[PDB]
Each structure stands twice: as structure tokens, then as C-alpha cells.
Design a protein around this nucleic acid. Structure first.
Ligand code: DCP
Ligand code: DOC
Ligand code: MG
Ligand code: MG
Length: 342
DNA sequence: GGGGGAAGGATT
DNA sequence: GAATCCTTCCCCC
């Protein structure tokens, strides 16, 4: 089994770059402006020029403008990015039908039946980068290894516009030396608590009693890390669809008033049914964000499809429940749709 | 005993 | 901040 993983370089910022020639060699920061106070919101993506001075995804915009005030700041245009992404993934499909589109900026190809060894895979990867650059002017990084996780790790390593093979000797070395925080699917909440116990490398995961590990990070992550350190991670490359679509918006202050909150909620529904195409969800969640970092939701699932008009009524009810079962005022309001037909 | 569903939590 | 996916828990056949 040979896996070829493809990840798009600083993707939202790079698409803005391709579109706007007046930008490339400068620092570029793609943001989501919550539209509240001036410069309210966060950084979604920054190019490498911007990253050098500390500005990266998830930091507050006002923070990015202190450590790098003169950069070019741009609002997120997710639909533009999604159009480009869709085109590149159709390019990817041509190299393998065994493809796992994991997110808007990355995918896994099972190229086992296509190539006989890592040398041929590396040439294939080069051909893939070349065609994506040619057709879309977008640089990508390719990872190649024996399974999905290590192929991504290879891409993580290959910096931007790179390509890298992690062979079998290399996985063994990586199991012992790679930081747990560098493992796909392991975020900082998980990395930090493990690190306090001295669990810093994948191999350490074997040194700790399974039951303690499961009590810390949960059964799934435990087994996941353990399977990695044991060099027996399986999981084939399979077709993936987006499971949920939704809209969450920030309100201009506001509070508890129903008829005040309702107009935002309604817009989020419009946008969510817009983005759903002709998918048809069976479940709906209304999500509100309180006056703190507190996120509260209420949902309902039906034995059938939810018509858009029906989305309206149910979503108000769900909101009524949130308002009734929580005293804090509401800052942001949204809706998520899931459990689609087929 | 194991879906399924709901509510909260974590990752990108 | 926004979008999405993951984790835990409850209940009933
Ligand atoms: N706190 C965070 C972390 C990440 N993201 C988004 C930004 C990224 O565009 C996207 C995917 O993460 P990537 O690490 O792949 O980021 P980039 O594609 O922008 O750059 P790179 O390819 O170097 O990873 O997740 C976000 O919105 N908020
Ligand atoms: P990123 O570094 O570009 O990685 C994206 C991947 C796609 C799926 C997966 N993912 C997404 C969202 C959540 N909550 N959990 C995940 O594991 O990361
Ligand atoms: Mg990327
Ligand atoms: Mg990515």
C-alpha cells in the first residue's frame, strides 16, 4: 500500500494571491471580520511572509495588527476558495479513483495499483504538482508513505511547495522522535495534557497503561495513537462527504429578545439552504454563543427531509428552548444541518 | 449491547 | 471567529 496525500499551500491566502497580482511578495492575511467593532474577528489564514512575524490562523485580528500592522488584510471569500478546490480535486480524481477528499484543501489518493514503488510514486507526485500549478497556478505539497497519517506527516514536513517520501525506516524513526502534537488529529488540548505527564513522543504512548490513557484523551484517540506507535495503523482510503453544513453569524450586540434574534437566525438558514444545494437534511441544530466563550445548542432530528420552510419553524422553537434554558444573553446565533438523505 | 439521538468538546 | 468533526452520555427495544 502506497498513499499519496496532497495539501494546498496556505490555501485561502494563496487563492487571493493568484487572483490579485498586486499582492504576492507581501504579507497577506485572510480574515473573518465578525462585523461587530472595527477589526473584530480572527485570522483564518496567513501567507508565509505574514507567518514569520507571528500572525497565524486563529489569532485575534487586533493581535495580528500589533505584531504586523501594515500587512494586506482581506476578508474570507470561502465560495471562491471552494470553486478552486472543487476544480483541483477533479484533477486529483484523474490519478486515482480511490480518493478521500478530507477537507477543502486536502485529499488522500491510494496509488497502490498505479505505481510499484516509492520512486514511481514520487514521479507521480511531481506530475500532480505540475498539473495543479499549470491549470490553477496553485502550489501544493505532496506526502507519500505507507498510510494516510504518515503521508500527511510527510506533507507537513515538506514545507510549502514540497514533496516528500517517508519510507519504512523513516516511519520507525518518526514513531520514536516525532512530537505527539505533530500527529494529525491531535490538537493542543490533547497534546498539552499528555505533555504534562511526559508523554511527548508517539512511542511514549506505549509506556502508559491503556486505561489511564483512555481516561485522559478518550478511547478513540488512545487506540489511534497506540496503533500509530505500534506501526499498525490501518484504515483504508475511502470516499468522504461533508456531514454537516451550517451558518453561524455574529449579532450587533443584542440580548435575549426572540424577535430580535430571529432575523439573524433566518439569514443563517437562507445561507445554509443555499449551501446545501439539493442535499436535503434530516437533522437541524440551532447553535448560540453566549456572552462568554460558552457555546450552547439544541437540535431536532426527523424521520424525513426538512423543507426550508419547516427549517424556519423548528429553528425558532429550538431557539426558544435555548433562551428558556440559559440566562446569559446571546452574541452569535446559527444553524447546522446534518443527517442528509443518503 | 448497541443504535440513535442530543448536548458539549476539540480540531483546523 | 467560522466551519466541521469528535466525545460523552442517555434511553429504549
Ligand atoms: N484556529 C484555526 C486553525 C485553522 N483554521 C483553518 C485555516 C486553514 O486555512 C485551514 C486549514 O489549515 P491549514 O493548516 O492547512 O492552513 P493553510 O492551508 O492556510 O496553510 P498550510 O497549508 O501551511 O497548513 O484551517 C481556522 O480557521 N482556525
Ligand atoms: P488541516 O490541517 O487542513 O486538516 C484538516 C483535516 C480534515 C478532517 C480533519 N478534521 C476536520 C475537523 C475536525 N473537527 N476534526 C478533524 O479531524 O482535519
Ligand atoms: Mg494547506
Ligand atoms: Mg490542510
Amino acid at each position: 500500500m502506497i498513499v499519496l496525500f496532497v495539501d494546498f499551500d496556505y490555501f485561502y491566502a494563496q487563492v487571493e494571491e493568484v487572483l490579485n497580482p498586486s499582492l504576492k511578495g507581501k504579507p497577506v492575511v485572510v480574515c473573518v471580520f465578525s462585523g461587530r467593532f472595527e477589526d473584530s474577528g480572527a485570522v483564518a489564514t496567513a501567507n508565509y511572509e505574514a507567518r514569520k512575524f507571528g500572525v497565524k490562523a486563529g489569532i485575534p485580528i487586533v493581535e495580528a495588527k500589533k505584531i504586523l500592522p501594515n500587512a494586506v488584510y482581506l476578508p474570507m471569500r470561502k465560495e471562491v476558495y471552494q470553486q478552486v478546490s472543487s476544480r483541483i480535486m477533479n484533477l486529483l480524481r484523474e490519478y486515482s479513483e480511490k480518493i478521500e477528499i478530507a477537507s477543502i484543501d486536502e485529499a488522500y489518493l491510494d496509488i497502490s495499483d498505479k505505481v510499484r514503488d516509492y520512486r514511481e510514486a514520487y514521479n507521480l507526485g511531481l506530475e500532480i504538482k505540475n498539473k495543479i500549478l499549470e491549470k490553477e497556478k496553485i502550489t501544493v505539497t505532496v506526502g507519500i508513505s505507507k498510510n494516510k497519517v504518515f503521508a500527511k506527516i510527510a506533507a507537513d514536513m515538506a514545507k510549502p511547495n514540497g514533496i516528500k517520501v517517508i519510507d519504512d525506516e523513516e516511519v520507525k524513526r518518526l514513531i520514536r522522535e516525532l512530537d505527539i502534537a505533530d500527529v494529525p488529529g491531535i490538537g493542543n488540548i490533547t497534546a498539552e495534557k499528555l505533555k504534562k505527564l511526559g508523554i511527548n513522543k508517539l512511542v511514549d504512548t506505549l509506556s502508559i497503561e491503556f486505561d489511564k490513557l483512555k481516561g485522559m484523551i478518550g478511547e478513540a484517540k488512545a487506540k489511534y495513537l497506540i496503533s500509530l506507535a505500534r506501526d499498525e495503523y490501518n484504515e483504508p482510503i475511502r470516499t468522504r462527504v461533508r456531514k454537516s453544513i451550517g451558518r453561524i453569524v455574529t449579532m450587533k450586540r443584542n440580548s435575549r429578545n426572540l424577535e430580535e434574534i430571529k432575523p439573524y437566525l433566518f439569514r443563517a438558514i437562507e445561507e445554509s439552504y443555499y449551501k446545501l444545494d439539493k442535499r436535503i437534511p434530516k437533522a437541524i441544530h440551532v447553535v448560540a454563543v453566549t456572552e462568554d466563550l460558552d457555546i450552547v445548542s439544541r437540535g431536532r432530528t426527523f424521520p424525513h427531509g426538512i423543507s426550508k420552510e419547516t427549517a424556519y419553524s423548528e429553528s425558532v422553537k429550538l431557539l426558544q428552548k435555548i433562551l428558556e434554558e440559559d440566562e446569559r444573553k446571546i452574541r452569535r446565533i446559527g444553524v447546522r444541518f446534518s443527517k442528509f438523505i443518503e
